[PDB]
Amino acid sequence: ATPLVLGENLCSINGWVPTYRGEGTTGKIPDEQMLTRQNFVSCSDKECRRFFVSMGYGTTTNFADLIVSEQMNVYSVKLGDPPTPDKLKFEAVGWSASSCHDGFQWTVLSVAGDGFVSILYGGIITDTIHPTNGGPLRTQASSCICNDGTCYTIIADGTTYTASSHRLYRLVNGTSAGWKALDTTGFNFEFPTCYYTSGKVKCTGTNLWNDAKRPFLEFDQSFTYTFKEPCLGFLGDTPRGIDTTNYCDKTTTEGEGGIQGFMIEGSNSWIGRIINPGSKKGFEIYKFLGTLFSVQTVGNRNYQLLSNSTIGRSGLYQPAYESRDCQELCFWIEIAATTKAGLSSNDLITFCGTGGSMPDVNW
Amino acid sequence: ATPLVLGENLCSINGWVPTYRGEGTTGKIPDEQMLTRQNFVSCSDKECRRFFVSMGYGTTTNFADLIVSEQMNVYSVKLGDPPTPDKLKFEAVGWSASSCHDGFQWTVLSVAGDGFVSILYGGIITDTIHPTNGGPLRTQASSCICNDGTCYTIIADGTTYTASSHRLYRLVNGTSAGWKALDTTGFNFEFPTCYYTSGKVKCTGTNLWNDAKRPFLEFDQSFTYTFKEPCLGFLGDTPRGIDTTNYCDKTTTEGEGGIQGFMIEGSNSWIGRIINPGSKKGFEIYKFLGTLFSVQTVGNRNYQLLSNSTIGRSGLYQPAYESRDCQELCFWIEIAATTKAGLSSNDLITFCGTGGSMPDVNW
Amino acid sequence: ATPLVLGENLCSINGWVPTYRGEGTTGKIPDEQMLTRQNFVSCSDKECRRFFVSMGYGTTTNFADLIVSEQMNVYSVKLGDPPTPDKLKFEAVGWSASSCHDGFQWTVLSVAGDGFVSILYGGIITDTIHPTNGGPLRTQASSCICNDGTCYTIIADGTTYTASSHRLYRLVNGTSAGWKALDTTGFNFEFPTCYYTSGKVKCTGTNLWNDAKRPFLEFDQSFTYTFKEPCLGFLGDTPRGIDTTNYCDKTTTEGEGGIQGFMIEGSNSWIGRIINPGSKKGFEIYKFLGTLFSVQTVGNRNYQLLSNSTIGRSGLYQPAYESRDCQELCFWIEIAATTKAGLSSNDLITFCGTGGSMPDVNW
Amino acid sequence: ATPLVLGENLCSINGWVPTYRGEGTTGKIPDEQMLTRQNFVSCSDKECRRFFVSMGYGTTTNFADLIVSEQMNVYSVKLGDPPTPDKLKFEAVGWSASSCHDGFQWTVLSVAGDGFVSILYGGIITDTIHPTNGGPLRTQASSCICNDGTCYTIIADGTTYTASSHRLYRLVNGTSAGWKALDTTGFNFEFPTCYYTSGKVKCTGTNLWNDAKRPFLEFDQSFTYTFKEPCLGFLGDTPRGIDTTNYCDKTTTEGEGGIQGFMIEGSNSWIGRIINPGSKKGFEIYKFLGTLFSVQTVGNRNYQLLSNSTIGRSGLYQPAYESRDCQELCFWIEIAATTKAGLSSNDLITFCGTGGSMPDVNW
Ligand SMILES: *[C@@H]1O[C@H](CO)[C@@H](O)[C@H](O)[C@H]1NC(C)=O
Ligand SMILES: *[C@@H]1O[C@H](CO)[C@@H](O)[C@H](O)[C@H]1NC(C)=O
Ligand SMILES: *[C@@H]1O[C@H](CO)[C@@H](O)[C@H](O)[C@H]1NC(C)=O
Ligand SMILES: *[C@@H]1O[C@H](CO)[C@@H](O)[C@H](O)[C@H]1NC(C)=O
Ligand SMILES: [Ca+2]
Ligand SMILES: [Ca+2]
Ligand SMILES: [Ca+2]
Ligand SMILES: [Ca+2]
Ligand SMILES: [Ca+2]
């Protein structure tokens, strides 16, 4: 085994094709399946896995019950496999999780009991992190980023989003190798969703407090970091008011509330978003020439990927292969499902970028 | 791993013995199984796999619904395994698929969304192919042929069969390495089912337009190709009128409509067909001394392999082993099933050729 | 991998302990399980497998139907695993089967269609055997014996048991390496169940014609063979009349009918049998000092292994390990079950010999 | 493979974090799962397994039936997997079991039929042990201890607890390599639960006769052994009266009855116990500076791990890895469950020690 190394240069992306689609994205879910929530995807050098948080089996769960965070566990499955009892791999106990593969073992961060974080490397507990700022900690709920055997993840603390604190942790073989406070003051940065290019990790957060755009974060291996705010009238977050003119300030109108989502910075740049913030129906992703951080930059192409489906969280992931100089970039989108008889499991659909332009398709 | 090399010389075939039979070919299907359609078989050097297109699970599907191509996904399973959720391997999104293993990875061609073709090599998307002549593209719906690390497949374009266009593609490690237009004019050539011998690939198509016989195609690595029409009163296609005298022309009577099926050219030659084109009941295969392309050649032995079973598509496949100088040849046949309560999944039965003659048997 | 070599010297056996017990031997069988018949056990150097013939799934099968040999298929499972759809390994098509592992692949003999035998080595069809003496052939329905990379099995031919013919086949890497006709005249020898010791294979047959004792057969690698008849008033077969005095003739009273069962020849010798031939209840095994072929020899110890259970076929098998100079010997016994709602699947219990004496136990 | 070697020095334990939790510990159990009893955990160098004794499947079992020891079988599963039919591994026939992995194979001791003990090494029967003192034998119902390729286990004999006898057995590659009678007179010592440190094995028994504290046992490779009685007013057993002053005698009040549980002796020492002996609700573990065997020693910290759950047996186990000089120590607790419709399966929750102090949590 060899430390996971990611490609320094990103693939040109001009289009998107689905690489995976759960069976609940179209039909109903069999009752025997585990009910999932907080799905995401994270890849090893061998394969891509779908992590999630269990709500219990659909058959042993009655509708009248609301189920509760303390009862929740973190499971894994191979992306492409359905969450049947036999496919499930128990990962840890918790109601929130993030994970990444360094090239040796899986590192998994879970939030449990009190609201602290267990860190487990290859299934065994190597470290715990405790809340200072009070109230429960919170993980990215997205793949963390490993490069050269050290992994980077962002952890949130605090009673409310008005009062949140965020630390950027560095992990090695499952133990914390230090961290840095991120200066958040005046705004809020939750559920960051991240990728790596050109020696820097680039994360799209979610502002649940005072913002209908998405804060953006750049940092490198030495923890020198800057927050950037996108200067485009295309509002990523949900809910949100209305599209605006471009400006490098933050859009405070309907800024409160939010759901996890991404933006991609590159040669081409992308913003994905929920189409109808009322009904939560549809998902669109939208292309831009040059940076998201210039007020100068121009909308080009809008792909309405999903129309008929109730959408929620979305996030990025990078699969790792020899491939070539090119680093592939993919993203997932969680979708409302229902069990054969009621119940609100979610399922996944994933897209990968192609260099080619693509035709208009509703999946 | 070593590039898949097929035997230059074909095994003498004088009979057929079944090597596999789905549980739906006899009893009813358990509701928890995935409903399948467009089944075929393709072999690696390690094993044979059964590909198919999902209609959803039988328990989560209600009868009153008709299901639709856009919801459909291409799965794989090991031949001999039943399509339980735990056995399935997600392969791609699409409503039509063909595949073949080059000795390294599986190549899979799927048709999805707009009606274009994704090509995926070892599960990742390496290439796409888009329709020029308009309307959806169409795959062999049969194993494609790999020899020496390059794979050959045939792709159909066009709004209607009167107007169809066919390209013969060449693929390497999942990217297209060029193609050639096949001259189809005056006829139509769908769902080719192919094998390899004596330095040539030989494919039996299905003419859905103006023919009750089956077009036949020979081509080699340099894409020099010729279409041949069989000169025998034994009508392959379905439906069809009646058996005729031998002639090297095409039988236009009841030539319209059709279903996928094969012919074998060799020392001994074979034509398989559905017995009762009205009821679609029964499958017979029929031996001939010498070519199918001489008007001279004589019927010899008729094997009625299936009598009690409702039949549909049929196709060839070559398993690959060291074995000997001899290249084994097998074929599958798709059979109507039903779930434990209604629903029309299909199952497979497969036959392999033996050198020996065989007694009369209804399987 | 190395050619399977069996121990020349047999373990001293003075008692029996169960090593495995199906869940149907106690409670009822879950409807989703495959219904089995003609269960037996055969071991590789890696593991022991349970072979059987399917009657279909218990949920998809209705009671009013009687199911038929032509619909039957041969499955394998790992001994200790239940025949769930996910555990099943399709082995061949047929209603009767025998198998043995040579140290490289599994050899399986199946009887199908016309009533001929397919021979498959490692899942592929290497050879077929056809009936001369008319009517369907018949396999041991018990593990065949492999030693030093050649395998030995016994095949029956003939319209009725009055008129049976038996050949002793030799197989290598799945092809027949010849056979010998066994001189059966005047009696009948079905379902032989065999083991290997002291350079000789020793088979206990079942006489369905004119005998309430069990024919016994000795042969070696060169196919020199003798039939012996046990000279003991303990009647192995079922049904049977009554226990007799000892004589080296054959007991013709109630000699007709029969069911597969064994005898063990050694320092100690064993005869196992169904206790109550009327109700088919119970199974006892019974120890003897010295040979079964001397009228001199004395009953010693009677173990009543099963009392409450409806019994049927029983057979031997030798597991292979390094262990020591000692060759272990075990046997299985097939037991009537019922599905959660009617239906007559069978399950297995197996016993292995220990050197120690054992207490009286009803399992 | 290499003989399993355990760490001489124990990890400092100042807190406990759950590493696994069964789905029945929170929700209801799906009916298709096997009903379990006598759960425990034992680890190999590869993985930890969960052993248990089957009551049959939840779907095929009706409530009105009480099920009986003779029908019971010993299964295994990988810790973290659910006891679905497809996950189960058949281990032996019996109603009571203990197991441990020496570094080569699993050794499993089972009690069946008459009440004797089968010993199976790597799934094959290597030895049996019979009762002298009459009445059924009994196993630890807990992981036995392997170190350097020899394994140690404790076996109970006798009609009643007033009259019990206990031998300490030594096993190698599955055969008994001798034993020693433990001097129990005047008390009783059942279901010992054990770990290894500092060249000694340390076991916490349960006195079902005359004691509300828990006997404690120290022995080494040469079988030199001493019984110690803990000198602390914290009563381990259940039921029990009331907490007392500290003294080195045994607490006779409500001494009768009992259930399996543990104590840890170390730098820090621990007693775990059921919180409310009436209702059997809740589990607390309690920390002590220095030995449990001095009247001098002081309660320090009480962790209430479980509050809302009905508790039963609890036991230790040591997972084995390279880790470091530190030998990890974990324990499991069995918890009442219920199937989707009635029935009293049990599930597991396991805790591992951390060096760090931990916050108060109700899991
Ligand atoms: C982490 O483990 C890798 C192999 O897993 C090893 O090469 C490296 O030295 C380890 N790093 C630390 C900080 O222990
Ligand atoms: C195709 O793949 C094989 C490895 O499977 C490799 O050695 C060869 O370089 C590849 N050729 C091309 C054109 O990609
Ligand atoms: C059979 O295969 C073995 C290896 O399994 C080989 O060594 C031997 O030469 C083979 N013989 C025949 C006749 O196929
Ligand atoms: C136990 O097993 C190992 C091989 O795995 C062997 O070398 C060792 O000698 C055995 N010990 C005994 C007492 O048989
Ligand atoms: Ca917002
Ligand atoms: Ca036609
Ligand atoms: Ca399963
Ligand atoms: Ca008889
Ligand atoms: Ca007590």
Side-chain angles (χ1 to χ4, degrees):
Chain A
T2 301
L4 183 75
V5 143
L6 292 165
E8 219 69 26
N9 294 328
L10 222 63
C11 282
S12 298
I13 290 135
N14 293 281
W16 301 94
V17 333
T19 42
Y20 171 81
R21 170 163 68 165
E23 215 66 36
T25 62
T26 47
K28 289 199 156 196
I29 315 260
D31 303 24
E32 68 254 49
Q33 286 200 24
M34 179 68 90
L35 302 165
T36 68
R37 91 155 189 81
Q38 144 133 177
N39 297 260
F40 64 93
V41 170
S42 179
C43 300
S44 84
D45 48 17
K46 175 188 293 86
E47 86 193 336
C48 291
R49 294 188 77 78
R50 149 162 180 211
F51 295 69
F52 60 86
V53 165
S54 74
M55 266 116 76
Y57 300 110
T59 173
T60 78
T61 296
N62 198 20
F63 182 71
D65 292 344
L66 274 71
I67 195 148
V68 53
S69 307
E70 291 69 22
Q71 294 195 290
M72 286 176 171
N73 288 317
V74 187
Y75 288 101
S76 177
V77 73
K78 196 208 84 188
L79 178 59
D81 281 341
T84 45
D86 316 334
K87 286 308 194 185
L88 294 209
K89 168 160 148 88
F90 189 102
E91 281 291 8
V93 289
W95 57 75
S96 166
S98 156
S99 76
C100 38
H101 191 277
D102 64 2
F104 300 106
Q105 296 293 341
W106 284 97
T107 298
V108 174
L109 303 125
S110 183
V111 176
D114 171 48
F116 73 105
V117 154
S118 295
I119 289 167
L120 49 105
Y121 192 70
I124 68 175
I125 307 234
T126 52
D127 210 319
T128 61
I129 297 174
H130 308 270
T132 66
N133 227 40
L137 302 153
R138 296 180 298 275
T139 56
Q140 302 177 324
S142 165
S143 167
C144 32
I145 285 72
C146 302
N147 201 43
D148 287 343
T150 66
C151 305
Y152 308 87
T153 186
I154 294 158
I155 314 235
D157 209 349
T159 308
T160 182
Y161 311 113
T162 78
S164 66
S165 172
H166 307 266
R167 301 135 87 91
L168 165 57
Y169 277 92
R170 160 183 145 113
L171 308 160
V172 190
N173 300 354
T175 48
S176 60
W179 55 270
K180 173 148 179 171
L182 294 179
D183 183 6
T184 191
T185 58
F187 72 99
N188 153 255
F189 185 70
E190 297 264 350
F191 310 116
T193 186
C194 307
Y195 62 109
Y196 172 73
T197 187
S198 193
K200 283 176 282 214
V201 173
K202 305 181 178 186
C203 297
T204 312
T206 276
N207 190 323
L208 283 100
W209 174 25
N210 52 17
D211 196 3
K213 301 188 195 191
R214 319 202 100 114
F216 195 89
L217 175 65
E218 220 188 58
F219 65 84
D220 60 11
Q221 59 182 22
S222 66
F223 287 147
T224 54
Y225 77 92
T226 74
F227 283 94
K228 309 180 143 211
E229 171 85 10
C231 310
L232 293 171
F234 210 73
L235 297 204
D237 215 333
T238 297
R240 52 168 154 87
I242 207 79
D243 288 329
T244 58
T245 57
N246 304 7
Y247 51 89
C248 294
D249 207 34
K250 143 208 322 172
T251 300
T252 79
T253 321
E254 282 223 67
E256 189 166 1
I259 198 167
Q260 184 175 17
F262 60 98
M263 294 180 309
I264 311 189
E265 165 75 13
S267 289
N268 289 311
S269 294
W270 300 85
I271 293 175
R273 86 194 191 170
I274 309 206
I275 298 178
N276 294 87
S279 39
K280 302 283 173 69
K281 285 248 189 56
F283 182 93
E284 63 182 336
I285 190 167
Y286 186 72
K287 192 177 158 180
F288 291 96
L289 278 316
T291 186
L292 303 104
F293 307 124
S294 190
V295 66
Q296 282 282 80
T297 51
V298 183
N300 176 260
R301 179 69 179 275
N302 167 272
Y303 289 105
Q304 286 202 6
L305 296 182
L306 302 198
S307 308
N308 256 344
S309 336
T310 303
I311 313 292
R313 316 155 54 244
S314 25
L316 302 150
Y317 70 93
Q318 307 178 286
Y321 328 103
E322 187 280 311
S323 297
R324 49 172 43 179
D325 293 345
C326 215
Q327 183 40 58
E328 189 101 38
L329 183 59
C330 300
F331 69 89
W332 55 259
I333 305 174
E334 190 189 50
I335 291 184
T338 62
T339 294
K340 185 194 177 174
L343 325 163
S344 58
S345 189
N346 317 72
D347 227 317
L348 272 203
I349 167 149
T350 84
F351 292 89
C352 293
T354 187
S357 181
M358 283 265 319
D360 293 334
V361 184
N362 174 356
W363 305 91
Chain B
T2 300
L4 185 77
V5 141
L6 291 166
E8 220 69 23
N9 293 329
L10 221 63
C11 281
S12 297
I13 290 139
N14 291 283
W16 303 95
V17 331
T19 46
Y20 171 79
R21 170 172 64 165
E23 213 64 39
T25 64
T26 46
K28 291 199 155 196
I29 317 258
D31 305 24
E32 67 255 47
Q33 285 197 28
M34 182 66 88
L35 304 168
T36 66
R37 95 155 186 82
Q38 141 132 177
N39 297 254
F40 64 92
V41 175
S42 176
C43 300
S44 79
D45 50 18
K46 177 188 293 86
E47 82 193 336
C48 292
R49 297 189 69 78
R50 153 161 176 212
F51 295 69
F52 60 91
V53 158
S54 72
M55 267 116 76
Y57 301 111
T59 172
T60 76
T61 295
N62 196 21
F63 181 73
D65 291 343
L66 275 70
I67 194 148
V68 53
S69 311
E70 290 70 21
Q71 296 192 290
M72 284 171 173
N73 286 320
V74 180
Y75 294 90
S76 173
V77 76
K78 194 210 84 192
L79 173 67
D81 282 342
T84 44
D86 307 339
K87 285 305 189 185
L88 294 201
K89 169 156 146 94
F90 185 103
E91 281 287 14
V93 291
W95 61 73
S96 155
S98 144
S99 70
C100 38
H101 192 278
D102 64 5
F104 299 109
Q105 298 288 354
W106 279 98
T107 300
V108 175
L109 309 118
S110 178
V111 175
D114 165 53
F116 74 110
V117 156
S118 286
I119 287 171
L120 49 108
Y121 190 73
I124 67 177
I125 306 240
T126 49
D127 210 321
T128 60
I129 295 177
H130 307 267
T132 66
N133 232 31
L137 302 152
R138 295 185 296 279
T139 52
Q140 306 179 327
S142 165
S143 166
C144 31
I145 286 71
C146 303
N147 203 43
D148 291 340
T150 66
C151 301
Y152 310 82
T153 182
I154 295 159
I155 314 234
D157 209 351
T159 305
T160 181
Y161 309 113
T162 77
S164 64
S165 176
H166 305 265
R167 304 134 88 92
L168 163 59
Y169 278 90
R170 161 178 147 115
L171 314 158
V172 189
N173 296 359
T175 46
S176 57
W179 56 266
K180 174 144 181 176
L182 292 172
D183 183 6
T184 191
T185 57
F187 74 99
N188 155 252
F189 185 71
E190 296 266 345
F191 307 121
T193 184
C194 307
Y195 61 108
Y196 171 70
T197 187
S198 193
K200 286 178 281 215
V201 175
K202 304 182 181 188
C203 294
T204 309
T206 277
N207 185 323
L208 285 98
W209 176 22
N210 54 14
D211 195 2
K213 299 189 191 192
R214 321 194 98 110
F216 194 96
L217 180 62
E218 219 189 56
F219 65 82
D220 60 12
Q221 59 182 21
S222 69
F223 286 146
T224 52
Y225 74 94
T226 77
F227 278 95
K228 308 179 145 212
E229 174 89 9
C231 310
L232 291 174
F234 207 74
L235 293 203
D237 218 331
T238 299
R240 48 172 155 91
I242 207 80
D243 287 329
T244 59
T245 58
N246 305 5
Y247 53 87
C248 294
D249 207 35
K250 150 209 322 176
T251 302
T252 80
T253 323
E254 280 222 69
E256 188 164 0
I259 196 161
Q260 186 173 15
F262 59 101
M263 293 177 313
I264 310 198
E265 162 78 15
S267 287
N268 288 312
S269 293
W270 299 84
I271 294 171
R273 83 190 191 175
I274 309 207
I275 296 186
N276 292 87
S279 40
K280 301 285 174 67
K281 281 252 193 53
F283 184 90
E284 68 185 335
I285 191 167
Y286 186 76
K287 192 176 159 175
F288 290 92
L289 279 315
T291 183
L292 305 105
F293 308 125
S294 188
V295 64
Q296 284 281 81
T297 54
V298 185
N300 175 263
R301 178 78 176 269
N302 167 266
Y303 294 102
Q304 292 205 0
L305 297 179
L306 299 199
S307 310
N308 254 343
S309 338
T310 301
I311 313 287
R313 319 157 46 248
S314 37
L316 300 154
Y317 69 93
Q318 312 179 274
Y321 328 99
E322 188 280 310
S323 296
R324 48 172 44 178
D325 295 344
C326 215
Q327 185 39 56
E328 190 97 40
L329 181 60
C330 297
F331 71 91
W332 54 262
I333 309 175
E334 188 191 57
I335 289 194
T338 58
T339 296
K340 184 192 177 174
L343 327 162
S344 58
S345 193
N346 316 72
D347 227 317
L348 270 201
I349 173 148
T350 82
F351 289 94
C352 292
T354 188
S357 181
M358 285 265 322
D360 296 329
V361 189
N362 173 355
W363 304 96
Chain C
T2 302
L4 184 78
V5 144
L6 291 164
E8 220 69 24
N9 293 327
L10 223 63
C11 280
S12 297
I13 291 138
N14 290 279
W16 304 89
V17 331
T19 46
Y20 169 78
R21 173 161 63 163
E23 214 66 37
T25 60
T26 46
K28 287 199 156 196
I29 316 260
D31 304 23
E32 67 255 49
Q33 288 199 26
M34 180 71 88
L35 302 168
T36 67
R37 93 152 188 80
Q38 140 134 173
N39 297 261
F40 64 94
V41 173
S42 181
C43 302
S44 80
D45 48 20
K46 175 189 297 83
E47 83 193 339
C48 292
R49 295 195 66 81
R50 154 166 172 209
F51 291 71
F52 61 86
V53 168
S54 69
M55 267 119 79
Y57 301 109
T59 174
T60 78
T61 295
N62 196 21
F63 181 73
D65 292 344
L66 274 71
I67 197 148
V68 53
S69 311
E70 289 71 23
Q71 296 194 287
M72 286 175 175
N73 283 321
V74 181
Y75 290 99
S76 167
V77 79
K78 194 208 88 191
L79 172 62
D81 283 344
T84 45
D86 315 337
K87 283 311 189 185
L88 292 204
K89 170 157 144 93
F90 190 97
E91 283 288 5
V93 288
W95 59 73
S96 160
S98 155
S99 72
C100 38
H101 195 276
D102 66 359
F104 302 105
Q105 298 288 347
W106 284 99
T107 299
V108 174
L109 305 125
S110 178
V111 178
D114 167 50
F116 71 104
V117 154
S118 302
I119 290 169
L120 48 108
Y121 191 69
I124 69 175
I125 307 237
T126 51
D127 210 321
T128 60
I129 297 175
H130 303 276
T132 67
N133 225 40
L137 305 152
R138 295 181 297 274
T139 55
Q140 301 177 327
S142 162
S143 163
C144 32
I145 287 72
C146 302
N147 203 45
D148 288 342
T150 65
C151 302
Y152 311 88
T153 186
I154 295 157
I155 312 247
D157 206 350
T159 308
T160 182
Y161 310 113
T162 79
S164 65
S165 173
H166 307 268
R167 299 134 87 94
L168 163 60
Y169 277 91
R170 157 186 149 110
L171 311 160
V172 192
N173 299 355
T175 48
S176 57
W179 55 271
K180 176 153 177 164
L182 292 175
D183 186 359
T184 191
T185 59
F187 73 99
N188 153 255
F189 186 67
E190 301 266 350
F191 313 117
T193 188
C194 305
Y195 60 107
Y196 172 72
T197 184
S198 190
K200 282 178 283 214
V201 171
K202 304 182 177 186
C203 292
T204 307
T206 278
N207 191 327
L208 285 97
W209 177 24
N210 52 16
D211 194 5
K213 302 189 191 193
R214 323 198 96 112
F216 196 92
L217 174 60
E218 218 188 58
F219 65 83
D220 60 13
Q221 56 183 22
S222 68
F223 285 148
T224 49
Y225 77 89
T226 75
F227 283 94
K228 305 178 146 211
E229 171 88 7
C231 309
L232 292 172
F234 208 73
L235 292 204
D237 218 331
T238 301
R240 47 173 159 88
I242 208 77
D243 290 329
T244 56
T245 59
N246 303 6
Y247 53 88
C248 292
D249 207 33
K250 141 209 322 174
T251 300
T252 81
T253 321
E254 282 223 66
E256 189 164 2
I259 199 164
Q260 187 177 19
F262 60 100
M263 292 182 306
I264 312 194
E265 166 73 14
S267 290
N268 288 309
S269 291
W270 301 84
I271 294 172
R273 84 194 194 169
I274 305 199
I275 300 185
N276 294 86
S279 38
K280 301 285 174 70
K281 280 252 193 52
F283 184 94
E284 63 184 337
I285 191 170
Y286 185 74
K287 188 181 160 174
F288 292 96
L289 280 317
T291 185
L292 304 105
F293 307 123
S294 190
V295 66
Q296 281 283 80
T297 53
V298 186
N300 174 261
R301 181 67 178 280
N302 166 269
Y303 291 104
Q304 288 205 5
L305 295 179
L306 305 196
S307 309
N308 252 345
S309 342
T310 302
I311 314 289
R313 311 163 51 251
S314 31
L316 298 153
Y317 71 92
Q318 306 175 287
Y321 327 102
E322 187 280 310
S323 298
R324 48 172 45 179
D325 294 345
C326 216
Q327 182 41 55
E328 190 98 39
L329 182 60
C330 304
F331 69 92
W332 53 262
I333 301 172
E334 194 187 53
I335 291 190
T338 60
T339 295
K340 185 193 175 174
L343 323 165
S344 57
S345 190
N346 316 71
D347 224 318
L348 276 198
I349 167 144
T350 83
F351 292 91
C352 292
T354 186
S357 181
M358 283 270 313
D360 295 333
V361 190
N362 172 353
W363 304 89
Chain D
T2 300
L4 183 79
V5 147
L6 293 165
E8 221 69 26
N9 292 329
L10 225 58
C11 279
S12 293
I13 288 139
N14 291 276
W16 303 95
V17 326
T19 42
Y20 168 78
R21 165 171 65 170
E23 215 62 40
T25 62
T26 45
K28 289 202 156 193
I29 315 267
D31 303 26
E32 68 255 47
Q33 291 198 23
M34 180 67 90
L35 304 165
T36 73
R37 89 157 187 84
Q38 138 132 178
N39 296 257
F40 65 94
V41 178
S42 173
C43 301
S44 84
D45 49 18
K46 185 184 290 84
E47 84 193 337
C48 295
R49 294 193 70 72
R50 152 169 176 206
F51 291 72
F52 61 90
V53 163
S54 72
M55 267 117 75
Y57 303 107
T59 173
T60 80
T61 295
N62 197 21
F63 181 72
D65 291 344
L66 274 70
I67 195 147
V68 58
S69 312
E70 292 67 24
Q71 293 195 292
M72 290 173 171
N73 287 319
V74 184
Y75 290 96
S76 175
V77 75
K78 191 209 89 187
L79 175 61
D81 282 345
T84 44
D86 314 337
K87 286 309 188 184
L88 292 206
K89 170 159 146 89
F90 189 98
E91 281 289 15
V93 293
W95 60 73
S96 158
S98 150
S99 69
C100 36
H101 194 273
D102 65 1
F104 301 105
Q105 296 290 343
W106 281 102
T107 304
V108 173
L109 302 128
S110 175
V111 176
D114 166 48
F116 71 108
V117 155
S118 299
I119 288 166
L120 47 110
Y121 193 75
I124 64 173
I125 305 239
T126 50
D127 209 321
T128 60
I129 299 180
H130 307 273
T132 65
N133 225 39
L137 303 152
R138 299 177 296 276
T139 56
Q140 304 183 323
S142 164
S143 169
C144 31
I145 286 68
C146 304
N147 201 41
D148 289 340
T150 64
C151 303
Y152 308 82
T153 184
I154 294 163
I155 314 236
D157 205 352
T159 309
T160 179
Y161 309 114
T162 80
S164 65
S165 172
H166 304 267
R167 305 129 87 91
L168 162 60
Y169 278 88
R170 168 180 138 111
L171 315 152
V172 190
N173 294 1
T175 48
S176 61
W179 55 270
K180 179 142 172 174
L182 291 177
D183 183 6
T184 190
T185 58
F187 70 99
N188 154 249
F189 185 71
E190 296 265 352
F191 313 116
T193 186
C194 307
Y195 63 107
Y196 172 71
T197 187
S198 191
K200 284 176 282 216
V201 175
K202 303 186 178 185
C203 298
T204 306
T206 278
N207 185 323
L208 288 96
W209 178 20
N210 53 15
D211 195 2
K213 303 191 185 192
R214 314 198 102 108
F216 195 93
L217 181 62
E218 221 186 54
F219 63 87
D220 61 12
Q221 57 183 24
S222 64
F223 288 143
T224 52
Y225 77 92
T226 77
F227 280 97
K228 302 184 145 212
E229 171 89 8
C231 305
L232 289 172
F234 207 75
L235 296 201
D237 218 327
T238 297
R240 52 172 151 88
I242 206 83
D243 284 328
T244 55
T245 57
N246 303 5
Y247 49 92
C248 295
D249 206 34
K250 137 213 322 183
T251 300
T252 80
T253 319
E254 282 224 67
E256 192 163 1
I259 197 162
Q260 187 174 12
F262 61 100
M263 290 176 312
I264 312 189
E265 162 75 17
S267 288
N268 285 316
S269 295
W270 302 86
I271 293 169
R273 88 192 187 171
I274 313 205
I275 297 185
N276 292 93
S279 41
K280 303 282 174 71
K281 283 253 194 52
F283 186 89
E284 62 180 342
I285 192 166
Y286 186 71
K287 187 177 161 181
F288 292 95
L289 279 317
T291 181
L292 301 111
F293 309 122
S294 188
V295 66
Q296 282 281 82
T297 53
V298 185
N300 171 265
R301 179 74 182 273
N302 164 270
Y303 291 104
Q304 288 206 5
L305 295 183
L306 301 197
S307 308
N308 250 344
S309 339
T310 302
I311 311 288
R313 303 158 54 251
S314 26
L316 301 154
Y317 67 95
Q318 305 178 281
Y321 329 100
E322 187 280 310
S323 296
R324 47 172 45 179
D325 294 345
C326 214
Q327 182 40 52
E328 189 101 37
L329 184 59
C330 303
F331 70 89
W332 54 263
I333 306 181
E334 187 189 56
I335 286 186
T338 60
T339 293
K340 184 194 176 172
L343 326 166
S344 59
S345 191
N346 320 73
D347 227 320
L348 275 195
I349 171 146
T350 80
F351 291 94
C352 289
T354 188
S357 182
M358 284 271 312
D360 299 334
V361 188
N362 174 353
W363 302 96

